[PDB]
Design a protein around this nucleic acid. Sequence first.
RNA 1: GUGGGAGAGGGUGGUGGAAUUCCCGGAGUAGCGGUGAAAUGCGCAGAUACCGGGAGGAACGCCGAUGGCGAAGGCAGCCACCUGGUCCACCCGUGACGCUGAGGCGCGAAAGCGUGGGGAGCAAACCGGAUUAGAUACCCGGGUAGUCCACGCCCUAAACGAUGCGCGCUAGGUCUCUGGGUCUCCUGGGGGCCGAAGCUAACGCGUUAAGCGCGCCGCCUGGGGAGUACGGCCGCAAGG
Lengths: 275, 68, 114, 88, 100
Amino acid sequence: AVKKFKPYTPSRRFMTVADFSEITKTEPEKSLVKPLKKTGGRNNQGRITVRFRGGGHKRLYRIIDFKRWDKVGIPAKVAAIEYDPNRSARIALLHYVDGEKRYIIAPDGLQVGQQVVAGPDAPIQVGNALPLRFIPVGTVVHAVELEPKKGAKLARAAGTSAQIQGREGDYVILRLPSGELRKVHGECYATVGAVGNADHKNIVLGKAGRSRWLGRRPHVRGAAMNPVDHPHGGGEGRAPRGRPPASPWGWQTKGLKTRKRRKPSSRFIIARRKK
Amino acid sequence: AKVKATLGEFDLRDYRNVEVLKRFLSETGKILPRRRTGLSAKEQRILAKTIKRARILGLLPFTEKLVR
Amino acid sequence: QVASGRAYIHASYNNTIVTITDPDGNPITWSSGGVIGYKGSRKGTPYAAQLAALDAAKKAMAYGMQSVDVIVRGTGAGREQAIRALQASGLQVKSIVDDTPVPHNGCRPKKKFR
Amino acid sequence: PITKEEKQKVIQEFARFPGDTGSTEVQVALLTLRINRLSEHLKVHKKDHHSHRGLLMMVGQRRRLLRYLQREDPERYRALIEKLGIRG
Amino acid sequence: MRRYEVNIVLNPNLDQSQLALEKEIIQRALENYGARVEKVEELGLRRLAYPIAKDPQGYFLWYQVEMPEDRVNDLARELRIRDNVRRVMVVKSQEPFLAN
RNA sequence: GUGGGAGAGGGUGGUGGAAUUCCCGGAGUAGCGGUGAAAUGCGCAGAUACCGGGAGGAACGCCGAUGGCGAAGGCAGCCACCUGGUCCACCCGUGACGCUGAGGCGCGAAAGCGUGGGGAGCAAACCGGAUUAGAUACCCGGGUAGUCCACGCCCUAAACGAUGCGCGCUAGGUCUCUGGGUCUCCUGGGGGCCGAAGCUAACGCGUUAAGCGCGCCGCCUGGGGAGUACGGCCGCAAGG
Ligand SMILES: [Mg+2]
Ligand SMILES: [Mg+2]
Ligand SMILES: [Mg+2]
Ligand SMILES: [Mg+2]
Ligand SMILES: [Mg+2]
Ligand SMILES: [Mg+2]
Ligand SMILES: [Mg+2]
Ligand SMILES: [Mg+2]
Ligand SMILES: [Mg+2]
Ligand SMILES: [Mg+2]
Ligand SMILES: [Mg+2]
Ligand SMILES: [Mg+2]
Ligand SMILES: [Mg+2]
Ligand SMILES: [Mg+2]
Ligand SMILES: [Mg+2]
Ligand SMILES: [Mg+2]
Ligand SMILES: [Mg+2]
Ligand SMILES: [Mg+2]
Ligand SMILES: [Mg+2]
Ligand SMILES: [Mg+2]
Ligand SMILES: [Mg+2]
Ligand SMILES: [Mg+2]
Ligand SMILES: [Mg+2]
Ligand SMILES: [Mg+2]
Ligand SMILES: [Mg+2]
Ligand SMILES: [Mg+2]
Ligand SMILES: [Mg+2]
Ligand SMILES: [Mg+2]
Ligand SMILES: [Mg+2]
Ligand SMILES: [Mg+2]
Ligand SMILES: [Mg+2]
Ligand SMILES: [Mg+2]
Ligand SMILES: [Mg+2]
Ligand SMILES: [Mg+2]
Ligand SMILES: [Mg+2]
Ligand SMILES: [Mg+2]
Ligand SMILES: [Mg+2]
Ligand SMILES: [Mg+2]
Ligand SMILES: [Mg+2]
Ligand SMILES: [Mg+2]
Ligand SMILES: [Mg+2]
Ligand SMILES: [Mg+2]
Ligand SMILES: [Mg+2]
Ligand SMILES: [Mg+2]
Ligand SMILES: [Mg+2]
Ligand SMILES: [Mg+2]
Ligand SMILES: [Mg+2]
Ligand SMILES: [Mg+2]
Ligand SMILES: [Mg+2]
Ligand SMILES: [Mg+2]
Ligand SMILES: [Mg+2]
Ligand SMILES: [Mg+2]
Ligand SMILES: [Mg+2]
Ligand SMILES: [Mg+2]
Ligand SMILES: [Mg+2]
Ligand SMILES: [Mg+2]
Ligand SMILES: [Mg+2]
Ligand SMILES: [Mg+2]
Ligand SMILES: [Mg+2]
Ligand SMILES: [Mg+2]
Ligand SMILES: [Mg+2]
Ligand SMILES: [Mg+2]
Ligand SMILES: [Mg+2]
Ligand SMILES: [Mg+2]
Ligand SMILES: [Mg+2]
Ligand SMILES: [Mg+2]
Ligand SMILES: [Mg+2]
Ligand SMILES: [Mg+2]
Ligand SMILES: [Mg+2]
Ligand SMILES: [Mg+2]
Ligand SMILES: [Mg+2]
Ligand SMILES: [Mg+2]
Ligand SMILES: [Mg+2]
Ligand SMILES: [Mg+2]
Ligand SMILES: [Mg+2]
Ligand SMILES: [Mg+2]
Ligand SMILES: [Mg+2]
Ligand SMILES: [Mg+2]
Ligand SMILES: [Mg+2]
């Protein structure tokens, strides 16, 4: 669901908020949080190197388990579902029967009070983790690793899912969230199901201030600048671009491909994306 | 040469009865009309509505080529 | 060079295509209404289809073919004439079977077939 | 569905005299039974518009008897709809 | 409870051992869902009218059962989970309709 | 109530194969396609035609019928669950509890709209080729909304049987679907055809009345202007 407001202020009229119904615990688990070093988009030189960043809400970072092959065969109960400010997706607090506690990103359908497990033998049900080779071809999956033991890299954002297409030797064939068709190694762990909070994309920020809370400062158009600042700078009155639309740094910005052609992972991408 | 005659007792519901049923499919595999099976309206319904099942389980064809 | 093969006759309203293949299903030669020298509407006639199947089998017998099974697709005019040509060709025509595609009410047809 | 057994209890708890099936009492009670189930069926299957008509007919049906029953013995009317929890 | 006829086709090209395992998965699964076995008939292979998973033949099973109405759907799903099971089809058992 | 029946009636969830398209491997050569005839188009940068692999979407061939179901719109592979109407036999229960229905409320083909998916085939708009005096068309090659899914809107129609619902009475022949019997046939309930009496301006209707009658409702009052204007209510808009 998504919550609307009555138009009692001009900005409320459009603003929509998340429904937060799946949340059962309004406090992060202390032994799993640590402080987020805000950067402002500035690097170790101090330079802005990603423009327009800063001034958002303070955040405590939740330590997530992107391995899971860490604890094969030890089951865990789903103790709660929590809000995580560092992602789109929601999180799930697991209490292992081991006694150890961990977070994973919360799949859609997960129940508070159910059980999950990881390993070659896990039942193919929501929340379990297996090497890709043992998940049946055709079932949809998330939190997928890209190389074995390297951590879950793909399908991590709310509502996303990858899907297994077929197999070819040591490798399985995934259709990624973007529609790209890729070979991933069969020993790459993955978690059955899709990520939850799929209603995320229907959120209407509603006013300038909301973006500000998110730590996103205002973006200024090239066309509004001067030639020193930007290719689109200057001109008397408004002006069309007057050259191929360009970035602040001059490269072409409508259409121009930038993936390195000789990149070694090319042997593994079957079909570049779509749409 | 109506097919119903050329058979004895048969159950129009036993969908595994492949050997019997496979007569009620023409040379090309298609379900035969009442004018050839001799079945009444009510019966031909149960006949077809089972033949379909038997195809799904793999026991009857969906289609066949036509040799001359 | 192969002894037995197949003959595929694609016979449509506008043309008749004949392709002879090997046992595993790989073409050896092909011919058609265009090949023998016609264009336009003449490509599809029975006489045209005749020249096709003959020239096709002539080309096929060059590489050593003797016996084929004939495969028919399409409700063309020059279908039946093409069948004639192959039997009379110098080939053995072991058998003839029609595997014309028929859908079980699949994709909506063009307006011309409605 | 409703089962034979499940239904008898209703017939048995509402019968006016030992052998009774289908007196206004039992009639309404039987109807209240299928109604409340269909209501729950439509609660999930919101797009089953055809079976809603059924419901509206039954709701209509039970309504006309209750008017009959309320007309002949008021004391008995309020008695049946209390045991059935009906007014609104 | 109602009466049904579970039909199942398996990979024909297994060994007799692994074959039993799938049945072990099957039999344990039937039990997990409150299924009660009545008749049961195992015809094995049979020449198929058409290839299933690109394989001209296939191994059959069959068990008349008694289990709860609400659980048959969830069962078939579980019945279909194995990469070796190739068709499942549970049909409500009904009395024979006879001709001649 | 008890006991049975037939059915594409409705909702949810699955799943089968035929075919079209695209992609991949093979093999193969000079054309393929299309029309009245053509051109556009596609094709030696290897097409068509053929064999194997794969991806995805939509619609269900034979059965299929002058058939079945629904109040209407409408509903067609198959499987399970949930659910509605309806007929039959027994003559067991209640005892006129009935009929209709201004407002109200719900349902309501296609197209259309909103947010999000999906997009194989088809295809308004649009482009190109032909035809032609012209061709903002008919024919051919392309092609976007849309057609599909979910939720929410719109509420119109040659929404038709151009025939409001219920009840009773007034010859029969025949074909068909579906219950029940004492299974020639008798009896119910639906679907067609021809016909008694009668009705009708005629055409035609005729136990499925458009006949003879009662009840209640909706509707008509010369053609156009006009389903327009104004007012009013509804809708995001279209517009009702
Ligand atoms: Mg939610
Ligand atoms: Mg709002
Ligand atoms: Mg509010
Ligand atoms: Mg509100
Ligand atoms: Mg204000
Ligand atoms: Mg405002
Ligand atoms: Mg959110
Ligand atoms: Mg939020
Ligand atoms: Mg939430
Ligand atoms: Mg600490
Ligand atoms: Mg940090
Ligand atoms: Mg430093
Ligand atoms: Mg420094
Ligand atoms: Mg930057
Ligand atoms: Mg910055
Ligand atoms: Mg969160
Ligand atoms: Mg937004
Ligand atoms: Mg923030
Ligand atoms: Mg922005
Ligand atoms: Mg700006
Ligand atoms: Mg400016
Ligand atoms: Mg300036
Ligand atoms: Mg400067
Ligand atoms: Mg400069
Ligand atoms: Mg510059
Ligand atoms: Mg400029
Ligand atoms: Mg200036
Ligand atoms: Mg300027
Ligand atoms: Mg100036
Ligand atoms: Mg300026
Ligand atoms: Mg200017
Ligand atoms: Mg300016
Ligand atoms: Mg301006
Ligand atoms: Mg300028
Ligand atoms: Mg410009
Ligand atoms: Mg300029
Ligand atoms: Mg310029
Ligand atoms: Mg990589
Ligand atoms: Mg031609
Ligand atoms: Mg087209
Ligand atoms: Mg009723
Ligand atoms: Mg009342
Ligand atoms: Mg499987
Ligand atoms: Mg190729
Ligand atoms: Mg060359
Ligand atoms: Mg092929
Ligand atoms: Mg009807
Ligand atoms: Mg009596
Ligand atoms: Mg009204
Ligand atoms: Mg509508
Ligand atoms: Mg529509
Ligand atoms: Mg529009
Ligand atoms: Mg739309
Ligand atoms: Mg869209
Ligand atoms: Mg034009
Ligand atoms: Mg022109
Ligand atoms: Mg034109
Ligand atoms: Mg066209
Ligand atoms: Mg649009
Ligand atoms: Mg539309
Ligand atoms: Mg009509
Ligand atoms: Mg009617
Ligand atoms: Mg009218
Ligand atoms: Mg009129
Ligand atoms: Mg009326
Ligand atoms: Mg009248
Ligand atoms: Mg009868
Ligand atoms: Mg009978
Ligand atoms: Mg009749
Ligand atoms: Mg009919
Ligand atoms: Mg008549
Ligand atoms: Mg007369
Ligand atoms: Mg009559
Ligand atoms: Mg009149
Ligand atoms: Mg006047
Ligand atoms: Mg007037
Ligand atoms: Mg108007
Ligand atoms: Mg109008
Ligand atoms: Mg007005």
